[PDB]
Each structure stands twice: as C-alpha cells, then as structure tokens.
Amino acid sequence: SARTSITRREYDEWVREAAALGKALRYPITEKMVNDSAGIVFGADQYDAFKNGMWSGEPYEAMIIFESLNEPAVDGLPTGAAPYAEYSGLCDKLMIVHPGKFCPPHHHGRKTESYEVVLGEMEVFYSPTPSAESGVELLNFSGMPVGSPWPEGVALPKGRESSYEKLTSYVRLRAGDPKFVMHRKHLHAFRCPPDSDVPLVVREVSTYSHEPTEAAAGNHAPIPSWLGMHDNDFVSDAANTGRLQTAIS
Amino acid sequence: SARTSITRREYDEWVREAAALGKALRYPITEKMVNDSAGIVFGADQYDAFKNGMWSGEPYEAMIIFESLNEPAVDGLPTGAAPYAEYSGLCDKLMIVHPGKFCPPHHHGRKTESYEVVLGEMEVFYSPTPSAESGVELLNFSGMPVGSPWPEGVALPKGRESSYEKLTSYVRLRAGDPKFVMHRKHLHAFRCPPDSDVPLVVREVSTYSHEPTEAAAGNHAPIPSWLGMHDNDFVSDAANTGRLQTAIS
Amino acid sequence: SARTSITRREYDEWVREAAALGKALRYPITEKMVNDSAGIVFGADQYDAFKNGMWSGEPYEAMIIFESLNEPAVDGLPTGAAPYAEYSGLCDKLMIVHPGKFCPPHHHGRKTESYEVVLGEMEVFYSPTPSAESGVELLNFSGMPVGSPWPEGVALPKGRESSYEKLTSYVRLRAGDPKFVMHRKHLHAFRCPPDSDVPLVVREVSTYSHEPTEAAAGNHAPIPSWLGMHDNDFVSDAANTGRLQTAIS
Amino acid sequence: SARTSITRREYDEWVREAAALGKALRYPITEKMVNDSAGIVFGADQYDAFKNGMWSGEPYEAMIIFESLNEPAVDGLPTGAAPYAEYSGLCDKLMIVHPGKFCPPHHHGRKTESYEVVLGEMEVFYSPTPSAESGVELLNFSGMPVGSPWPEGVALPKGRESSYEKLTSYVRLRAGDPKFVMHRKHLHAFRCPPDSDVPLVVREVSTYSHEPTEAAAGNHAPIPSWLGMHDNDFVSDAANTGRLQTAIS
Ligand SMILES: OC[C@@H]1O[C@@H](O)[C@@H](O)[C@H]1O
Numbered sequence: 001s002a003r004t005s006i007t008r009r010e011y012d013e014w015v016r017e018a019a020a021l022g023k024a025l026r027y028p029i030t031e032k033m034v035n036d037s038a039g040i041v042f043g044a045d046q047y048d049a050f051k052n053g054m055w056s057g058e059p060y061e062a063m064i065i066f067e068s069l070n071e072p073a074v075d076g077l078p079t080g081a082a083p084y085a086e087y088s089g090l091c092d093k094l095m096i097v098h099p100g101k102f103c104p105p106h107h108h109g110r111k112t113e114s115y116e117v118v119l120g121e122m123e124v125f126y127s128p129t130p131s132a133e134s135g136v137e138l139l140n141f142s143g144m145p146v147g148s149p150w151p152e153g154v155a156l157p158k159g160r161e162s163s164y165e166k167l168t169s170y171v172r173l174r175a176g177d178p179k180f181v182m183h184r185k186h187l188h189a190f191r192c193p194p195d196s197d198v199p200l201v202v203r204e205v206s207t208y209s210h211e212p213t214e215a216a217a218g219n220h221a222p223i224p225s226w227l228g229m230h231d232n233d234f235v236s237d238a239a240n241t242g243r244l245q246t247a248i249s
Numbered sequence: 250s251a252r253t254s255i256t257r258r259e260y261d262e263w264v265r266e267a268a269a270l271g272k273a274l275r276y277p278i279t280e281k282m283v284n285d286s287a288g289i290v291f292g293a294d295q296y297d298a299f300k301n302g303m304w305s306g307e308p309y310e311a312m313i314i315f316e317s318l319n320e321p322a323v324d325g326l327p328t329g330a331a332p333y334a335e336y337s338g339l340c341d342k343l344m345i346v347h348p349g350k351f352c353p354p355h356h357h358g359r360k361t362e363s364y365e366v367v368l369g370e371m372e373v374f375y376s377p378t379p380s381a382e383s384g385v386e387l388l389n390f391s392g393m394p395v396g397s398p399w400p401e402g403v404a405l406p407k408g409r410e411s412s413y414e415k416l417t418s419y420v421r422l423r424a425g426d427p428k429f430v431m432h433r434k435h436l437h438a439f440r441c442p443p444d445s446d447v448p449l450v451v452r453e454v455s456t457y458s459h460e461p462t463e464a465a466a467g468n469h470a471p472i473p474s475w476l477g478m479h480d481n482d483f484v485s486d487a488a489n490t491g492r493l494q495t496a497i498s
Numbered sequence: 499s500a501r502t503s504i505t506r507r508e509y510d511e512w513v514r515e516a517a518a519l520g521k522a523l524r525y526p527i528t529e530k531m532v533n534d535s536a537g538i539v540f541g542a543d544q545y546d547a548f549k550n551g552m553w554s555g556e557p558y559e560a561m562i563i564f565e566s567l568n569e570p571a572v573d574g575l576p577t578g579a580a581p582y583a584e585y586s587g588l589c590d591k592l593m594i595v596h597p598g599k600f601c602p603p604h605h606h607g608r609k610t611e612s613y614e615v616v617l618g619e620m621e622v623f624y625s626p627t628p629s630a631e632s633g634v635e636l637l638n639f640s641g642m643p644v645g646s647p648w649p650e651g652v653a654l655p656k657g658r659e660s661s662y663e664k665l666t667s668y669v670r671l672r673a674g675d676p677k678f679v680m681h682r683k684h685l686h687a688f689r690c691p692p693d694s695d696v697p698l699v700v701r702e703v704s705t706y707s708h709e710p711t712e713a714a715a716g717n718h719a720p721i722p723s724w725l726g727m728h729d730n731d732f733v734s735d736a737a738n739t740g741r742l743q744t745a746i747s
Numbered sequence: 748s749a750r751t752s753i754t755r756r757e758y759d760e761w762v763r764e765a766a767a768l769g770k771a772l773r774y775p776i777t778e779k780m781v782n783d784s785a786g787i788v789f790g791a792d793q794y795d796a797f798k799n800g801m802w803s804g805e806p807y808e809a810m811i812i813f814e815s816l817n818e819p820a821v822d823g824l825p826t827g828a829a830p831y832a833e834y835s836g837l838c839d840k841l842m843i844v845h846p847g848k849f850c851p852p853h854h855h856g857r858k859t860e861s862y863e864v865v866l867g868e869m870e871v872f873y874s875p876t877p878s879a880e881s882g883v884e885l886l887n888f889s890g891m892p893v894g895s896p897w898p899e900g901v902a903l904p905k906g907r908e909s910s911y912e913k914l915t916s917y918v919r920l921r922a923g924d925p926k927f928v929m930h931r932k933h934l935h936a937f938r939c940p941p942d943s944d945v946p947l948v949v950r951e952v953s954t955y956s957h958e959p960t961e962a963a964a965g966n967h968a969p970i971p972s973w974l975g976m977h978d979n980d981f982v983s984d985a986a987n988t989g990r991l992q993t994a995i996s
Pocket residue numbers: 011012015016031034035036
C-alpha cells in the first residue's frame with residue numbers, strides 16, 4: 001500500500017489551505033505562488049505521509065514553500081563580483097510544516113538563511129561545525145552558536161534516522177524571538193512539534209536560492225555559471241531527487 | 250520658533266507607539282530595537298515636523314526603523330569574495346512613516362532593497378536610470394522598471410523640493426502586492442500619503458546595511474574594509490548629517 | 499456512491515485546519531472548542547460535499563463553527579424578565595465557510611445576529627420581510643434594509659434550490675465594513691463565493707443561541723423554559739435534522 | 748499647573764494612533780468611529796494624565812473606546828418584553844488602555860459584558876458580590892467567580908484609591924484565554940500593567956450600552972423608557988460627569 005504519489009485532491013487541499021493560512025498571516029502570496037511546485041515531498045517513500053494525512057502527526061519529510069522573492073541582486077555589482085554573486089541575492093519565502101513533519105537534513109554551499117517564526121514553534125536541528133570545501137580557504141566571523149542538546153523523544157522518519165546523526169545542536173524558536181541565522185555550509189533540518197495544534201509557519205529570509213526546479217526551468221540566468229547551479233545538498237540521497245518534482249495523480 | 254530638537258516625551262510617544270504598532274502586525278521587535286536611534290529626523294530643519302506633530306500630515310523628512318536583522322553573511326565565503334562581501338548580507342527591518350512624511354531622496358552603492366507593505370500604502374519615487382561608478386564596469390540583468398509619472402499634487406518638504414528632481418518614476422505599493430525591488434545605485438525616496446488614516450508600515454528585506462551610526466559604533470567589523478563604511482548617500486546634504494543621531498532634549 | 503458520512507481523516511483535516519486558520523486570525527479558540535460538533539453538514543445528502551472535497555467549489559450546505567461564548571446573561575435580571583430572557587444573552591463565534599458552500603436558509607424566533615467578516619467575502623441572502631408569530635404583537639424599530647437583488651449566476655445546492663426562493667435580498671460583506679445586523683424572525687443564508695482563494699471567515703456576535711445539540715446535551719438550564727428550547731428553524735427539512743450531529747466514520 | 752483639558756494635538760495623536768493600532772489588529776473601525784468622543788478622561792483632575800503623557804506609566808483614569816456596534820435588538824420582540832429590552836441588545840467595541848491607566852470602578856444595572864484581550868494583558872478588579880436593587884427580586888444562575896486577591900503593589904490614581912476598596916477580586920486576562928464575563932450589577936474596573944510595552948487592547952462584547960452622551964444625543968429611542976437612560980454608574984463622583992465629554996482646547 002506504500003503510496004507512490006499524492007492525489008490531485010490531497011495536493012490541492014494541502015496547498016490551498018496553506019496559502020489561505022499564509023494570507024491570514026499577512027504574507028504576500030500571489031496567484032502564481034500557489035502552484036504544483038509549492039507542496040514538496042522529499043522522496044517516493046515519503047508519500048506515505050498521505051496514507052494517514054498531514055494531521056496524523058507522523059514523522060515524514062514534506063513541506064510547503066511559498067516564495068515571494070528570489071532576487072539575484074546582480075544589477076549594480078562590479079564585474080569583479082561575478083564569481084561571488086551566487087553567494088548573495090535575496091530570497092523571501094513562507095514555509096509551512098505540519099505536526100511531526102520535517103524539512104530534512106541538508107546544507108547549502110552558498111545560501112545563508114534566517115528564520116522568523118510566524119505561527120507555531122520551530123525545532124531546528126543542526127551541526128555547529130561548518131563543512132569544508134576542498135582546496136578553498138573560507139572566511140569566518142560569527143560562526144554558529146553551539147545551542148542545546150536534542151530534547152528527549154524526537155521521532156524521526158522511518159529509514160532516514162541516520163541522516164540526522166551529525167545535526168547534534170538543537171534550538172526551539174518561537175514567534176517574537178530574535179531572528180535566527182543559519183550560516184551556509186552548516187547541516188540543518190527542522191520540524192513542527194508533533195503535538196502542535198497548528199502547522200509551523202516560518203518566514204525565511206536568505207541569500208539567493210539556486211534551484212534548477214520544474215517551476216524554475218525556463219528563466220534567464222543573470223550570470224552564466226548560475227545556469228543549472230544547485231545549492232541544496234540533502235544528506236539523504238532519496239531526498240535530493242524527489243525534491244525537484246511532486247507526483248500528483 | 251524653528252524646532253532644533255525633539256523632547257523626550259515627543260520621542261518616546263512616537264517610537265513606543267510605533268513599536269506597539271509593529272508588534273500588533275507581528276513584526277518581531279525585541280527590547281533592544283526600541284531605542285533612541287529608532288526615530289530618525291533627516292536634518293535640523295526637519296525637527297519642525299514636531300511643531301504640529303506626526304499626524305499633521307505636513308511634508309517633512311523623518312521616519313522610524315526597527316531593524317531585526319543585519320547579517321554580514323561573511324561566514325562560509327571563499328576568501329576571494331572578501332572585497333565583494335559588502336554587497337551581500339541580509340538586513341530585515343520594519344519602517345514606519347507617518348502621513349505626508351518621507352524617507353528622503355538617496356541611493357546606495359552596495360545595498361539592494363525590496364519592499365513589502367504591511368499597513369497603509371507606499372508611494373515610491375525613483376530614477377529608473379542607475380548611477381555610474383567612475384572607473385568600474387558594472388553588471389546588468391533586470392535593471393529597474395520605468396514605472397509611471399508622478400501623480401498630481403505631491404507636497405514636498407520646504408527647502409528640499411530640488412532633491413527629488415531626478416526621481417522621475419513613481420509606483421504606489423499596497424499590502425499583498427508582489428515584492429518590489431530597488432536595485433543598488435538607484436536614487437529613491439518614498440512617503441506615506443498625507444490623507445492616510447494609518448502610518449505606512451513597510452517591511453524591507455535588503456542586503457547588508459553599512460551605517461556607522463551611534464547605535465552602531467561599538468561592534469566588530471567582519472571584514473577590515475567594512476569598518477566606517479557608509480552606504481547611504483542622501484541627495485540633500487542636510488540629510489546625511491542629522492541622520493546619524495536624533496537630538497532629544 | 500452518494501456519501502452518507504465523513505471519514506475521521508476528512509473531518510479532522512477540515513476542522514483542525516480551520517481551527518489553525520482561526521488562531522492565525524487571532525480568534526480565541528480553546529481546546530474544547532475543537533471537537534466533533536464543530537464541523538456541520540446539513541443533511542445526509544450534503545455529505546457528498548466530501549466526494550470532491552471542501553476546495554471543489556461545489557454548492558453544498560456545510561460549515562464550521564467555533565463558539566467562544568454563549569452566555570445566558572440571566573444573572574442580575576429582574577424576575578419579571580424570565581420569559582423574555584431567551585431573546586437576550588451573548589453568543590460569540592467564528593464561522594468558516596469554504597468556497598461555494600452555504601450556511602443554509604433558516605431563521606430564528608429569538609436570536610438576532612451581527613456579522614464581521616475577518617477573511618474572504620460573505621454573500622448574504624435574506625428576506626427583508628420579518629416573519630409573523632401567530633397571536634403575538636411584536637416591536638419594530640429599525641427593521642431590515644432592503645439590500646440589492648441577487649447577482650447573476652449563483653449556484654445553489656442540488657435539491658435545495660427552492661429553500662432560497664424567499665431570501666430575495668442580497669448584500670456582499672467584506673473585512674472592514676460596518677457591522678451587519680440580521681434581526682431575529684428574518685430568513686437568511688450566506689455563502690463564500692466559489693472563486694474565493696480563501697475560506698470565508700466571519701465573526702458572529704448575536705444573542706443567546708438555543709441549540710439542544712450533542713455537544714450541548716449535558717449543561718444546566720438557567721431558566722426552566724430554555725431546556726430543550728430550539729431556535730434554529732431551517733427552511734429545508736433535511737437540514738434541521740442532520741444539523742444536531744455529524745456522522746464520522 | 749494641574750491640566751484642565753487636552754490640546755487638539757494631544758487628543759488627535761492619542762486617538763488617531765489608537766485607531767491605527769485597532770486597524771492593525773483587524774478591528775473594523777470606520778471613519779465615524781474616530782471622533783472627539785472616542786478618547787475619554789474620567790474627571791477634570793484626570794487631565795493631568797497628559798502632563799507627562801500616555802506613555803508615562805502613571806496611574807490615571809482614561810481610555811479610548813471605538814464602538815462598532817450598539818444594536819437595541821428590539822425588532823422581533825414580543826411587546827411584553829418592552830420593559831426588559833434594556834437588558835439585552837448587542838454592543839461590540841474595542842477599548843484601548845495605556846500602561847498604568849484605568850477604566851475606573853463602576854457598575855451597570857443592565858449591561859453584562861465579556862472581554863477578549865487582543866493585545867497586551869488586562870488586569871480586572873471586581874466585586875464577586877452582586878449589588879442589590881431595592882424592591883426587586885433578581886435571577887441567579889452562574890454568578891461571578893471569586894478570582895484571586897490583588898497582586899502586590901498596584902498603583903491607584905491619586906485621590907481615587909478609595910473607589911477601588913470593594914473591588915476585592917482580581918484576574919489577569921491574556922490573548923487566547925476563554926472569554927471572561929462581567930455580569931451586570933457587579934462593581935468592576937481594569938487597567939493595563941504599568942510595565943507593558945504595548946497598550947492594552949480589548950474587545951468587549953456586551954448587551955446594549957445605555958449612554959446619553961454627546962456623540963449620542965441625537966438618535967431615535969427604540970423604546971420610550973430608553974430615552975435619557977443611563978447605565979454606567981461610577982463609584983467616584985468625579986468620574987460620572989467628565990465622562991460624557993472630553994475638553995479639547
Ligand atoms: O491556486 C492555483 C492552483 O492551486 C494549486 O493546487 C495549483 O495546482 C494551482 O494550479
């Protein structure tokens with residue numbers, strides 16, 4: 001019975017309700033942002049999230065993202081910043097995670113993010129140690145805070161527990177807290193607590209998001225290198241693939 | 250009678266009410282963000298805004314800014330991006346402009362901004378033509394849209410009308426609109442309409458904001474060059490000075 | 499295939515998402531308010547609303563109601579008001595209607611309501627003529643406004659079109675409008691437009707709501723007569739029954 | 748220097764900012780609701796609240812009220828309820844109280860209220876004992892909860908401390924709490940804590956509010972008796988007078 005896709009009705013009710021929730025929270029969601037790419041399921045074996053549904057509280061890797069901005073910010077840059085432009089830019093999006101579900105372990109080589117919880121609470125799991133990039137020196141300034149150890153009893157997705165091993169630091173964010181920064185080159189993941197009465201709704205403000213997705217394939221590249229450039233490295237292999245497209249039957 | 254400062258009571262009621270308005274709108278305002286640097290008056294001759302008050306509807310250059318984030322985003326960058334890092338980073342802030350008042354004509358060589366109106370309506374005045382930087386070539390991708398001509402009857406601040414001459418393009422932004430981008434090296438200004446029943450409240454998401462201000466003098470510089478680096482170029486000379494400090498008696 | 503009930507999963511996702519939407523809108527929803535009585539389906543033949551779902555846009559009679567208050571307001575009343583107390587009291591509730599769905603034609607002999615749209619838009623259908631009560635004289639003061647004729651093309655629920663015949667007046671309410679009053683003894687109904695991108699969310703402030711429901715059977719009666727007193731008269735017979743309980747399988 | 752009035756500028760900034768705060772919180776405030784009757788000062792000696800201002804945190808009796816509804820609910824009533832109609836009706840309003848300020852001790856013979864905190868926190872002081880009405884028997888059902896004793900260190904307005912003596916019960920209400928009912932014939936008062944970073948904003952849903960005020964003198968009476976009927980009995984004599992009008996110079 002292992003689900004291999006999500007029905008059109010399951011997808012629409014999930015995404016359309018989330019868009020309404022976002023609008024209720026005053027996030028500027030336009031019509032084009034509500035599409036078949038908004039609802040993400042990280043891997044075929046994660047489609048089972050819909051066996052019992054988004055309110056089951058079960059641990060699965062899936063989420064909704066409504067992106068209001070992803071500005072290259074290339075205009076006005078001295079030509080010499082061409083090779084480093086990919087680390088800048090501005091991406092603003094609203095992310096919705098239901099109870100128990102996760103935005104799976106992953107890291108970005110270029111994108112640095114920041115979180116602002118709007119509704120619910122966000123449990124962030126991450127490695128305070130930055131990853132290295134063979135052959136290249138890297139700058140340091142603030143680095144990541146050590147945080148706290150994981151709380152007891154966190155249910156991880158079946159068959160993906162190991163992908164979380166290195167994300168030893170934990171922090172729980174709430175509405176009204178100071179903005180939290182997730183520096184690039186740091187493994188991170190997050191979920192909405194299983195007992196939450198509401199979906200987790202978080203506003204992410206980060207640098208440009210390099211994603212050669214389906215709802216992406218068609219735009220013009222600001223800088224040659226950017227074309228087909230990917231910057232979302234998921235720890236679990238089964239997550240990097242099913243991420244670029246949602247199977248809707 | 251030309252006011253030369255703002256009284257402690259005038260300042261607190263202006264800034265504390267604005268902070269409450271921001272909180273009502275769910276913007277994450279922390280205690281340290283509500284300080285004596287939040288309320289800005291651009292020039293001694295602009296203190297007359299307080300002769301009749303922030304609800305007079307009169308044209309003056311003053312505003313409130315609550316900055317929740319100003320992240321250098323230097324961590325994880327290849328050492329080669331050191332000289333171009335100043336063009337990136339992440340700055341999130343809530344700006345409050347009362348009826349008739351303006352965020353005066355100015356431009357940034359490094360900072361690219363984006364606007365999201367939360368409450369009220371925002372009238373943006375800008376030059377669709379980017380400024381040049383002697384001796385350096387610059388990248389181009391999207392540039393700025395031409396916009397529309399100014400609507401009839403815009404009252405400008407007395408003695409500062411000329412600073413607006415080059416900002417020929419106009420656009421009126423409302424809550425729910427697509428995010429609007431103001432590329433770096435473009436002259437821009439904005440105001441809250443004089444007949445607005447509410448202050449204009451806008452969320453700005455931009456690259457790092459280089460400002461060697463009073464509430465700034467004391468931090469550590471992520472990159473040597475950044476120290477004392479200024480990136481807010483106001484057209485009116487009387488605006489670049491009184492911007493770094495508010496005279497409260 | 500005519501549905502005869504709603505599955506536990508269908509019910510929970512419908513009601514739990516609505517509760518989250520309400521909370522997003524700051525309505526004070528407590529845990530006990532989110533129960534198996536919140537989601538209402540007016541008649542067995544209306545369960546087909548779940549054949550295609552709450553986002554199908556199809557015309558069916560069903561809605562969600564989260565009641566925060568239903569105060570008899572009997573305390574402090576002179577004993578002589580005992581027989582007229584049933585016309586007073588205070589009932590505050592949040593009602594959520596999905597696109598195309600209706601709160602079916604009905605009237606109350608005692609309850610006078612008022613509407614405040616919080617999200618979406620509300621299309622109210624009603625009779626400007628008050629109903630009569632055989633043998634009893636009634637007071638008049640403001641009466642109901644005549645309103646406008648129905649807009650063209652309103653899709654009514656299959657097999658229930660006639661129940662709307664007498665509700666000739668129409669009015670479309672939006673967020674920010676003046677409070678709208680629906681005097682007792684007036685036939686009324688309302689729906690969320692089929693093309694709405696969001697569920698209709700309305701705050702109703704009315705006099706006491708006499709409803710001997712399932713989630714009601716168990717309380718103490720403030721005044722003898724009130725016991726088992728019903729005040730929700732639906733035009734369609736198939737609506738008065740299936741209203742007191744939702745079949746969840 | 749004892750202030751004897753409030754200047755036009757002081758009044759407008761106080762009331763216009765409050766209206767904007769209300770709108771930010773989605774309360775349906777129309778243009779006519781923002782008038783010279785919205786800002787209330789209970790007594791000439793309370794005008795000193797403006798010596799240091801609404802953010803001084805000092806104890807004074809003053810508040811702002813934006814009434815969206817005050818429906819007699821007389822239509823549809825059997826003629827026999829004419830003498831008891833004054834106890835019913837529907838009044839919806841948003842009340843704004845700044846830090847340290849109070850809605851002074853008082854009681855209503857007819858009006859029963861309910862509170863829903865929208866922003867900030869509300870400290871309610873009241874007598875759990877209902878007042879008696881010479882010669883008339885009264886109904887009882889739920890009565891008022893006993894509550895808790897006052898917290899230590901509540902600063903009361905100078906010269907009005909005694910008016911609070913009988914309001915022995917205390918309860919602190921927050922956003923999201925169950926609706927709180929204040930039965931008619933109970934002495935009550937409330938304030939916004941002095942250390943609050945935001946004004947207290949509360950939505951009150953009560954029965955009809957009988958107030959022959961300035962912004963009232965001119966309407967038609969639904970029932971003869973109602974004409975000139977007053978239902979706001981303040982413990983302090985200096986409060987019952989200056990309540991019907993605000994001295995603006
Ligand atoms: O609201 C837009 C539509 O809704 C979503 O379900 C997408 O399929 C898109 O086609």
